Subunit: 99 residues, 6 copies
Amino acid sequence: RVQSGKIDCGDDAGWAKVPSDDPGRDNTRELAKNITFASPYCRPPVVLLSITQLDVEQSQNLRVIARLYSVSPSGFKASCYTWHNTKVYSMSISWISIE
Amino acid sequence: RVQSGKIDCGDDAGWAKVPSDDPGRDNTRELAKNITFASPYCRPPVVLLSITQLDVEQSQNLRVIARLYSVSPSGFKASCYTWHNTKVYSMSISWISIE
Amino acid sequence: RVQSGKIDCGDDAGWAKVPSDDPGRDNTRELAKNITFASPYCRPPVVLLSITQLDVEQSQNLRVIARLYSVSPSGFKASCYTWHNTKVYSMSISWISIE
Amino acid sequence: RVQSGKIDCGDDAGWAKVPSDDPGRDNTRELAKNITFASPYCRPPVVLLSITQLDVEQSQNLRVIARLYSVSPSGFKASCYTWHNTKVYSMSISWISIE
Amino acid sequence: RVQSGKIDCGDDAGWAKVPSDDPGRDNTRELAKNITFASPYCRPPVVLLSITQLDVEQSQNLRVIARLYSVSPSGFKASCYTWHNTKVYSMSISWISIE
Amino acid sequence: RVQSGKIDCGDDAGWAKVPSDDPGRDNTRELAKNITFASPYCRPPVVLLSITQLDVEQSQNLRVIARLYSVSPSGFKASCYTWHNTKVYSMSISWISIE
Ligand SMILES: CC(=O)N[C@@H]1[C@@H](O)[C@@H](O)[C@@H](CO)O[C@@H]1O
Ligand SMILES: CC(=O)N[C@@H]1[C@@H](O)[C@@H](O)[C@@H](CO)O[C@@H]1O
Ligand SMILES: CC(=O)N[C@@H]1[C@@H](O)[C@@H](O)[C@@H](CO)O[C@@H]1O
Ligand SMILES: CC(=O)N[C@@H]1[C@@H](O)[C@@H](O)[C@@H](CO)O[C@@H]1O
Ligand SMILES: CC(=O)N[C@@H]1[C@@H](O)[C@@H](O)[C@@H](CO)O[C@@H]1O
Ligand SMILES: CC(=O)N[C@@H]1[C@@H](O)[C@@H](O)[C@@H](CO)O[C@@H]1O
Ligand SMILES: *[C@@H]1O[C@H](CO)[C@@H](O)[C@H](O)[C@H]1NC(C)=O
Ligand SMILES: *[C@@H]1O[C@H](CO)[C@@H](O)[C@H](O)[C@H]1NC(C)=O
Ligand SMILES: *[C@@H]1O[C@H](CO)[C@@H](O)[C@H](O)[C@H]1NC(C)=O
Ligand SMILES: *[C@@H]1O[C@H](CO)[C@@H](O)[C@H](O)[C@H]1NC(C)=O
Ligand SMILES: *[C@@H]1O[C@H](CO)[C@@H](O)[C@H](O)[C@H]1NC(C)=O
Ligand SMILES: *[C@@H]1O[C@H](CO)[C@@H](O)[C@H](O)[C@H]1NC(C)=O
Ligand SMILES: [Zn+2]
Ligand SMILES: [Zn+2]
Ligand SMILES: [Zn+2]
Ligand SMILES: [Zn+2]
Ligand SMILES: [Zn+2]
Ligand SMILES: [Zn+2]
């Protein structure tokens, strides 16, 4: 069984600063969301993320990650992530889960 | 059952102007395609879109959406979508459908 | 049955020049990877690729393709691909395979 | 998708005489039932029948068939079947359908 | 997901007398077994029973039922059942469960 | 994936005597068939057998087994089996295989 949805991260003025896990990256920032499946699994499904909306400032490099932090039978944690001097005006992630 | 394919939207000189559904966005433009499954379903499958080709002008912001408008047992409507002064030289969407 | 993973292509200083399959594109370059499933299929699965990390130079156009070259019951060939004067500092592809 | 149920044919005093399709068999008799799935398929499912109740007269040979006549996406035709001088006091068929 | 196994009820000298649920039947007797799946489901699977071994006394009528009492995500209750003056020397039930 | 079919064992005058695997049973006889799937699996499917035709002599006890000897990705070995002084005029086994 298969479910899908979309996460809208919005403008990065709304994202949280987080510690960087890469010493070559600073000003690491993200919008993390815990998603609850509209039907829990008995064991974690496979999840794939896709970036289906981007609005990014041209005067600075494009730096984006769609992160999948963890997955459980009832949902998952994912984030829109950026760093350094990138400005993201909007980013959305589509996802699918397959049992 | 699982199907996949790719939609090539090409250069936005070929896209249609459409009414904007967001008053903060103007010059909204898209390449819409109705895809017919190579095997109809009995009820709509789950569809996920992925942007697997982008060629975008660096002097203006990157603004892209891969839209899924609707899905039926025999196919779906999807578009490459941009707005304002972005120039897209090519954009392609890969898709998968899962019954 | 469903498998997934991620391919990290890294900085394009590490990519290979390849012959261009499009006369309108030069300096065609890619990082190709042959992935071996953590469980072989009896006939090729359906595979979808998603670009889940991009770090690209703003002073030149964004030009990226996530290519799926071929798929077999035991794995597939995919690449991160760019051309002309684009500079990619990092690119990663997430994939899912469904029997 | 998987469905199941049971057909109770009861005492053969209630069965219909039918033409014999085997010249070595006479007094061919059956209880035929058309079953409608509690959820139609798009193409015929695979159906298996199992005889899960028998009450048969010991003074004559045991002669029973559980017949599957035909199967469609929305149901199937099955019968309890006997012949010659057998007496069946009750017979029930359990079935399963798998898409 | 699909599991199967077999229940051997043996000689009815080993079966339990049970109250009859049919006033037309007396001396109702059965061998009931609670089966635990070799892998629990999240919600009850569909189960089908099949009588795959019978050794029955010819001087009395053949009277047998393979009963499915109940089914849960982790197993099911089934019995070999007879009544009146039938003698069963052995009876075995094969089963399959499909999620 | 799901396949089914039927094995017709016919009159036991055609069955082979086999060594008995039970010292309490003599004159052990069977009709063994190796079935080849109309589509090989990559690993053995689950198989269930059902006795869907019986014609047995009333003057001797009913003694029948539907045996599943072994199963492989491309087929299985099954038999109609009887013993002692039982006479089987016809026996047929229906089967289903589920990947
Ligand atoms: C300190 C920091 O975040 N540095 C970043 C580096 O991580 C990389 O993204 C580069 C190319 O875009 O831009 C900056 O140098
Ligand atoms: C009117 C219009 O389309 N305005 C756009 C806005 O929607 C947003 O995309 C922004 C950042 O890229 O660029 C412009 O201001
Ligand atoms: C020769 C070559 O690669 N030319 C490229 C062309 O293929 C297209 O990518 C364009 C817009 O970004 O940029 C350059 O003109
Ligand atoms: C004419 C007729 O039905 N004949 C039947 C034959 O078909 C077979 O069932 C046999 C053994 O039970 O009993 C009778 O001879
Ligand atoms: C009281 C009782 O169990 N009566 C049984 C009846 O239920 C039915 O099985 C019949 C034919 O075999 O044999 C007997 O009459
Ligand atoms: C030696 C032999 O096969 N003996 C059989 C025994 O196995 C059992 O089937 C019994 C009741 O039907 O009938 C005979 O005694
Ligand atoms: C969100 O749920 C995930 C489980 O997938 C857990 O790892 C994470 O820490 C949770 N955080 C919050 C604040 O809900
Ligand atoms: C395309 O098909 C979709 C159904 O998925 C429908 O909603 C849409 O309006 C159709 N448009 C055209 C012109 O085919
Ligand atoms: C990688 O494996 C693929 C099969 O999917 C094959 O087409 C390709 O040429 C192989 N190349 C290398 C050097 O392994
Ligand atoms: C019952 O439905 C079946 C289709 O599976 C058809 O073949 C059969 O003749 C029907 N008969 C009656 C009277 O409904
Ligand atoms: C066996 O388990 C079933 C559940 O499927 C329950 O209904 C039944 O009463 C149990 N009985 C015993 C004694 O275990
Ligand atoms: C039939 O094939 C089975 C494999 O399922 C094997 O065990 C058996 O011995 C074979 N016998 C014959 C003579 O084909
Ligand atoms: Zn800097
Ligand atoms: Zn502007
Ligand atoms: Zn140039
Ligand atoms: Zn006769
Ligand atoms: Zn009596
Ligand atoms: Zn004897």
